[PDB]
Amino acid sequence: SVLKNTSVIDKIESYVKQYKPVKIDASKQLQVIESFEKHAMTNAKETESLVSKELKD
């Protein structure tokens, strides 16, 4: 309202409203991260098996 002879505020506001869905979230990673986790789980379980058997020994 402070601007009196805008002639362009409507245009930019319409552009912003049309471009409100700028982009969706990128949830692409669903298996490679799972691969890293399964490798880490394997390493952790073999590690703790080794540790437990070593302390018992």
Place this chain on the structure above:
Amino acid sequence: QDLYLRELKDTKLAPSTLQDAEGNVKPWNPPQKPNLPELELQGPEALKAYTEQNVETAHVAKESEEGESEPIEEDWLVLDDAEETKESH
């Protein structure tokens, strides 16, 4: 008041063709109808980047890359590299 009324309508008629009536502009020869509404309308666009910022160019965000689906080579290489450094802790 003669000191008042005549100066009043003089200060009204001189910008009357300038602002109230569409008689271009009498006090100074250069035209104003095609200058501030028309030539200076792009003035903010002339000082700024025309057709580059007033359009507000929206670049779609580039898709964020990742390990590029490498479930064997990356894990094995990481394990081997950690094994190299584990002997020198």
